[PDB]
Ligand binder design. Structure first.
Ligand SMILES: CNC(=O)c1ccccc1Sc1ccc2c(/C=C/c3ccccn3)n[nH]c2c1
Ligand code: NA
Ligand code: NA
Ligand code: NI
Ligand code: NI
Length: 266
């Protein structure tokens, strides 16, 4: 395995982001003088997460640097994203800096990554602002591929009693445990809303237990202040009850590439 490397190549620092990420550590890869992120350690899931990261490559997907899978503790070496997660980044930013153009740019990058996954027949299953990472100059990458899967059909069935982030999860996924690229499209809609609100929590003040009933009744979050109408329209298409009525990531991406360029012209 070309991805396999010597653990002693890495000097292990403190846990990343005060522990919010689970067991993931800042580390220094000494040879290359490089700060990296190291995921350590059922290991069954852990190892497949690594095999997946070896299959996917894209400028907006967090890149695998290497692994030590041969003996415990197991390492998963991932590129270090200097600004941390998108949620905290949106909350803490200077909005004059991270403005309407930047928000468009973020959606374009993320949708670019999802269009690539869609074309490859993968699903992510954990899309959300907390799972995106931010680099210099508002570079954004999707991370956390632990639940990512290469599909054999058009649908994937989570194991019985698996539990999900209710406010990001598509109705068919909540009810039937069925995931598809369409379910990702739904979650991407929630991510857009997180972006438009600079990291507000979705369905504000609405208790988790009532969310599914509301969706069945075709309640959807309102258009965030300052959110351009075209973007709200996309959100609403993402939240269609029928998965087959949700746009593809190819379409979503094209819509953002268009908006982003027109905004850059101004
Ligand atoms: C087990 N958990 C994950 O794999 C996971 C889940 C959600 C989001 C990310 C990750 S893995 C991860 C975590 C942090 C990073 C970073 C840097 C994090 C950071 C950097 C500055 C300040 C605060 N946090 N670079 N690359 C990373 C990869
Ligand atoms: Na999801
Ligand atoms: Na599962
Ligand atoms: Ni593109
Ligand atoms: Ni494209």
């Amino acid at each position: 395995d070309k991805w396999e490397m010597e653990r002693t190549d890495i000097t292990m620092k403190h846990k990343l982001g005060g522990g919010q990420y689970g067991e993931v550590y800042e580390g220094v890869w000494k040879k290359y003088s490089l700060t990296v992120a190291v995921k350590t350690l059922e290991v069954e899931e852990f190892l497949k997460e690594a095999a997946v990261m070896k299959e996917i490559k894209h400028p907006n997907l967090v890149q695998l640097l290497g692994v030590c899978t041969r003996e415990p503790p197991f390492y998963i070496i991932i590129e270090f994203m200097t600004y941390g997660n998108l949620l905290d980044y949106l909350r803490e930013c200077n909005r004059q800096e991270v403005n309407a153009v930047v928000l468009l740019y973020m959606a374009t990058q993320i949708s670019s990554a999802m269009e690539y996954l869609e074309k490859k027949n993968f699903i992510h299953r954990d899309l959300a602002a907390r799972n995106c990472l931010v680099g210099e100059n508002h570079l954004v990458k999707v991370a956390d591929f632990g639940l990512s899967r290469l599909m054999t059909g058009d649908t994937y069935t989570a194991h019985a009693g698996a539990k999900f982030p209710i406010k990001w999860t598509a109705p068919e996924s909540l009810a039937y445990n069925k995931f598809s690229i369409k379910s990702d499209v739904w979650a991407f809609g929630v991510l857009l809303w997180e972006i438009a609100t600079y990291g507000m929590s979705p369905y504000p003040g609405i208790d988790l237990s009532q969310v599914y009933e509301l969706l069945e009744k075709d309640y959807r979050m309102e258009r965030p202040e300052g959110c351009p109408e075209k973007v709200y329209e996309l959100m609403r298409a993402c939240w269609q009850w029928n998965p087959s009525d949700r746009p593809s990531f190819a379409e979503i991406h094209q819509a953002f590439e268009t908006m982003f360029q027109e905004s850059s012209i101004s």
